[PDB]
Design an enzyme around this catalytic site. Structure first.
Site: not given
Lengths: 518, 498, 517, 504
Positions: D59, D106, D243, D301
């Protein structure tokens, strides 16, 4: 080693079957109610006492025949036989009375003026049907009167007409005004006043004839427990019988007889409206192909078990026993399989009404049912009944299912249930315990009607109401204890489940106790 | 909306039952073998032709009566009838011949004495009853019961003192039953020995061996049949307490089983026969060995053109129980309505087969299925799983001996199993197995084996199309093997019908 | 709410597919939380917050600390717990557990210091000595440890693990009083670290002189349970039982399974114990780390089957020693312990010494409550009832009926009056969804009940009323008031009530379905 | 061996009770391992060890790094992988996965203090305790009064009090910095399916011939359709793995799954967007629905997080890995553990060891029963053949299911029925070989032998290649029974033949 408990514990139904053991004897209690049609072989007080001793729970009166005077005397006799045992309430067995309606029947006339005369019919030959009342008592090999005024309108050419339990088959060649010409498609002896079916035809007789009205009125006057309503086609038919019974007959249970294609099709609405169902296989297996009857039977038993409403399996269950002291292997199998299907009650017709061996027929139904009850795969049955049940905040329902779970856990000798109306005991029966359900009531009608439900043993407490209600509750529990002991369901120090409510009156059952037998 | 497919998809057996639908018509295929006893009613060539058209798969000859000459003519007539259809192999239906033995018997010659004194042999009366079983005293104890004339009379216990527990008219040379006794009569009688040799000579397909009590009785029958009869199937008749109790050893030694309910309900309480029936059917289903339900299935049809409601139910319930075959005795041997009796078993069997709850049934047959390294067994289970997954029209199996198709049958697919064989005896014997529809390929052996394999698969396609099992473009499952000869079935294909 | 859409699924796969992040759990949390008490969590002030955050059992690790110190900890736990006694509706029982040192192997001090560390380099040499002159003079060349017999139980090739198995050594030479080793996995070596000899058959006593003194101290201090470290066989448990004696006979012995022999002899150990701890820390050093989930699931299944409490322990929220929230693996571990069937889950360093002890308790509470709702009770209860035995015991019959009844009406609670706890234990073993509010007058019963999934113990302080029926009602209505106050249910909900037919132990036989007043 | 005592149990409870630490697993490990490549793992020499340790998919995280940098990583991956190419019997294909940056929002804060969020570009370079600028121009339209706003991977929690700006109150306080990530729990975020950077990165993936894309922040089917469009005709065979990272994604999961080739349970970001205590529900739901659909699902994760700094994992970590496999995850994943940590090889080996143990502990009896019950009757021959093969594999406890496949599909259809036996997928298509790693139980082998002149002989050569692979890798031996799947004519879509064969 007993009650097929080794089979009971199998993790699969195949393994359950493999473990079924002819050397594993059943317990004493028989759960499936036995309904016996009363007639000339069984209407004497003397024979009726033996019917009761042999396991009869319900007396059926077939109103397709006989006068009110005749039925009144049968009823009187059933009550004389039944009350002959009333002196010890501990051993008294309640007996229900069922009125089975004539309903929309087609009947033939008298062979040569005689109710018993017959004429042999050679196959292939010709036969005239007539509505001309001139010949209503002069039927013979050549002309055959029947009583359906409208017959000619609802049948066309090539139509098939069936007589005497579908055993004689006739084909319509030519239509007349008051007649039909036919060839005997299948032949045999033709007798008097035989049933006629027109399976291809939209028969238009009323749900409740004038005769049915008179009979249902007599039923109310005679305090019958239930009506078995013939040829129910739709919910409105059931509503009609209910309205006819009206307020005086409001507590009389209506069992709808499903005997034709429309009744099967509209089965769900019929069940909703009824108190219970009879799978009336006799006519059903003439109205639809005989090879589809087991489908109809299993569908109706399944749907009644799912709804918690009583279902009766009926007709020719032990037919050969009309003439022989032992049944055929198909008959033994039929009785066992009705119980295994889920039927609350099984029935005898000619076997008890007219046959040579009424008592042997009742005893054989008793023996087979008890063996079949032990052979039930309760593990899956109970799992599926619990799963399919609408889940409700109803505290009576929760108490009932807990009692049945408790009874399996300790293999209880009984579930004792106090009930005024029967409902609390009905709620337990729905979940199909192995343990017999001893339903203690002071209501004689509740006690008779409770025989409709698999597993219920109604006992009629005659003791006076005690001043203190808790003492009165304990009195009736103790009565139940004494009854189970005397009948050999259980003994001192066995464990039994007891169901009671928190206050007097109907609808408060909420208390399950696990108690040792004193 | 056909074949009870709605009920088929239910998550519980209760909901399956609630969905059963008298208006959901079955497919054409009927899977359950029908065994018909031949007698005066059914023995002529013309009637036998109609019997076959009505659905007879096996002709049962009862050697309890009749001469060899008689039975040889019956067999000849069965074969004339059967081969009258031989000209078109696509439509030809094989018909098996079964020889049901007389077997070992006890025969005769208040208060009543049983004596073995052969001077009392022709002097039978209300005080003295003579019997032909010399060891009766070794087998019975004080309190044991004795039934006479197929159960009609009842008694309680080189002599025996007995009170008559159920009276009747006592005749000459009547059958006697000893409930609960270990009867030690030989596995086979003198007559049986001769009848079995006749069976081998007449090339019968199977033997229904009477009154089998233990594994060694089976071995004896097998020994009598000998090498010339090694391929004849032995179906043991379980007729009494001992046979039921020693069932597992009998089953292991047998090719299959008959639940002989007639004799069973004389020997054991009549109310217990259904237990014994259900136990034997489940155990045979678990072993993969054929089981026949017998006796009084449609009994009223001896006299009447329609059966009783209990008879309708009995046939259906035998099928739902798992019986590979259902049988007719008096109904076809002697009755007034043999053809109607055969037709009614066909109709009921077919309805019942659609009503089977295959979801649980196959799941349980999976679960109880032993893990073995046998390739043929793995191929069979795969083929049945595949047939449910795609609702195939059939499972086509090439088989020499029958074994490959038997291995499929035991997992009980809904789809018919078309067993294509060149072995005529295999084609006849295959009727013993639920779901097997045997077809006898008569085409010559092609020089290239691959092509001869394809010829037989295509034969099976033509049979299914002609018989209405499937049509062009439907998917079917096909089983073949990796080389010629038996034992090599290892190839499952999902194939469109051409 | 309560994952009831998932609950109704006819397969486990469909149950899974229906799990819903938007279906909130009930207020009630059934899985006991066990918290190791140390300097981060010992003050009465902090202990009060531990309790409010969900702590049910305070664990004291006797691997460290003096009796004077542990008596002070116990006093503080009792002071904190009793600060809530003024309102009996909100009082929460809190149990005290003593976890023994057992046969531990410990290293000495790095250069005379408790905190000092040296770096061990892969491939370097490290000499192990038993000579007590080096007991406080460990360094990168010489490592003392306290297991005098170590030379007799190792060979050349042996592996020796130090500090939660993070440092590993291979024995290159066996001497008489020493071992010369080679470092395989290096790292920082500190003082007084735990040592494991996975190959070896360590011959330290199951119950040492120090353990005996500690178990006697437990009896004297009225502890509720003992977690016995390193149980290898049934006789080890019987040695602990013997020490607690008649006076300690009501103290629960939880056997910690933390080596290969304990797993191998699991069944005899469980039969002798009152419960089990899956002590995953040592266990995952003594056996391969990838096999620990196998041992955990086996032990939890066997305990659920036997009806004996089982605790999942060690590193469940480890990162939270340093961080205010856990890793995703840690979230998953806690939920999966509950789904496996763990009665209790445990916190060690997370509450003993970490920076976020209150957050670690709250998080175990939050995850457990979610996991409990996600259990597939349809299959669980069916299997528990099948695998249980049909028995002549009337209390068992009532317990299983009360649970069945709780499913039928989705009851708010099963309220059980109990003296010894046994009647509520019998209900717990069947894993109802409904919380089991166990009403007792017995303080120890109340504390020990935390060992059973689903039991919410409530201690009735009211004096016994002369009229028994009224005394029963008093306790039932007390349970009703706790349920309403804690948000388990409201007026008009249905609850199941279990009592006996008279006062005293062992008569539980009556189940009633009653509305909440 | 292989927990076969536990495998025979009639109940799940008894199955748990029989799990045995002394029952050793077979050689085959079925669960794909996806390793994130970074400074610790990016050399050719380390990549060789990563392959030998169990890596199946490399990945590449495009949240950081230039196209040149990643190009060099890819080049190194392929150098390491092809170093084993000389022996096709032993050669292990390695896939390359591109994991997109995706859309982003952000930018000391005290609990209870009031903070204004401004989209007024005036304050781009001037955020503080009182005014905080955001680059998500439509933020006000997707949040309500009472909406929560998370800042910097969830460290800071704000609640909206008045809605070009928003007045917020700090609920969870902390030290605010520059360029910190923002999340909006429960909001329908209307950011584009792909960023401008994503489009460039996806085209680069097509250039670089990657096997799959892990598409970040997938919220709805239309997001997947836009990734598919960008990959376009040249990229039409590249698998898109969505995802799932937030509430909307979880709630719109069915439509996303249908549009995708598979799913990543993106637990890092999901546990920022949703309560951390609810993440296990999300994972078990998504794994369950993927199993039901037959599409690959990846668990991601922090699975072995402690191993970034330590050579052994925590007990919670071991448990998480084993539980992902028992849940039904096709692949498991490593991020910082392999990208940057001190023990990349040990992290790979530990996922290998855990996975193999857990695969033996699966309760196949119930699992297979339920998959069949929930799987439609269809007229598809390959599906029927596939289910027949798995059933046959259980009945003879076969050493393998050998499947010839061009596209992967026939092997994928076997994999969804979760056999115990490894599925050796023999293909001539190198991309199919690499992409097969997404599916539990598939061991792809890449056959390089010349096409034989008789098609039936070329079929047989590929079957025997699979035999040599299984023998060489110790999956089975001469005389073991294996299941073989083939078709009746060449080209995809015709698998229909199942044979039970002894290993030669």
């Amino acid at each position: 080693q007993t009650q097929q408990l080794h089979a009971a514990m199998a993790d699969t139904f195949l393994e359950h079957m493999c473990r079924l053991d002819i050397d594993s004897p059943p317990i004493t209690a028989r759960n499936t109610g036995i309904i016996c049609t009363i007639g000339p072989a069984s209407r004497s007080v003397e024979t009726l006492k033996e019917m009761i001793k042999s396991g009869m729970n319900v007396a059926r009166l077939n109103f397709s025949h006989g006068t009110h005077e005749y039925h009144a005397e049968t009823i009187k006799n059933v009550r004389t036989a039944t009350e002959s045992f009333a002196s010890d309430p501990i051993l008294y067995r309640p007996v229900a009375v069922a009125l089975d309606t004539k309903g929309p029947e087609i009947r033939t006339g008298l062979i040569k003026g005689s109710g018993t005369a017959e004429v042999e019919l050679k196959k292939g030959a010709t036969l005239k049907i007539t509505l001309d009342n001139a010949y209503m008592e002069k039927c013979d090999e050549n002309i055959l009167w029947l009583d359906y005024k409208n017959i000619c309108k609802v049948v066309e050419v090539g139509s098939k007409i069936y007589v005497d339990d579908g055993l004689i088959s006739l084909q319509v060649k030519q239509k007349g005004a008051d007649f039909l010409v036919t060839e005997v498609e299948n032949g045999g002896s033709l007798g008097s006043k035989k049933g006629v079916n027109l399976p291809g035809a939209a028969v238009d007789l009323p749900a409740v004839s004038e005769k049915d009205i008179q009979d249902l009125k007599f039923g109310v006057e005679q305090d019958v427990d239930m009506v078995f309503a013939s040829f129910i086609r739709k919910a409105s038919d059931v509503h009609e019988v209910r309205k006819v019974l009206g307020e005086k007959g409001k507590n009389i249970k209506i069992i709808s007889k499903i005997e034709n294609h429309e009744g099967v099709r509209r089965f769900d609405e019929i069940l909703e409206a009824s108190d219970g169902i009879m799978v009336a296989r006799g006519d059903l297996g003439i109205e639809i192909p005989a090879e589809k009857v087991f489908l109809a039977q299993k569908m109706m038993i399944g749907r009644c078990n799912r709804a918690g409403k009583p279902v009766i399996c009926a007709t020719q269950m032990l037919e050969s026993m009309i003439k022989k002291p032992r049944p055929t292997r198909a008959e033994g199998s039929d009785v066992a399989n009705a119980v295994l299907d889920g039927a609350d009650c099984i029935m005898l017709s000619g076997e008890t009404a007219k046959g040579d061996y009424p008592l042997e027929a009742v005893r054989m139904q008793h023996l087979i049912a008890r063996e079949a009850e032990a052979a039930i795969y309760h593990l899956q049955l109970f799992e599926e009944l619990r799963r399919l049940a609408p889940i409700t905040s109803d505290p009576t329902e929760a108490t009932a299912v807990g009692a049945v779970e408790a009874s399996f856990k300790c293999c209880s000798g009984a579930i004792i249930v106090l009930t005024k109306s029967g409902r609390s005991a009905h709620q337990v029966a729905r979940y199909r315990p192995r343990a017999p359900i001893i339903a203690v009531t002071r209501n004689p009608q509740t006690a008779r009607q409770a025989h409709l439900y698999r597993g219920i043993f109604p006992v009629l407490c005659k003791d006076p109401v005690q001043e203190a209600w808790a003492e009165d509750v304990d009195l009736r529990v103790n009565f139940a204890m004494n009854v189970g002991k005397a009948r050999g369901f259980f003994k001192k120090g066995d464990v039994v489940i007891v169901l009671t409510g928190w206050r007097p009156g109907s609808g408060f059952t909420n208390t399950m106790r696990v108690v040792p037998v004193p």
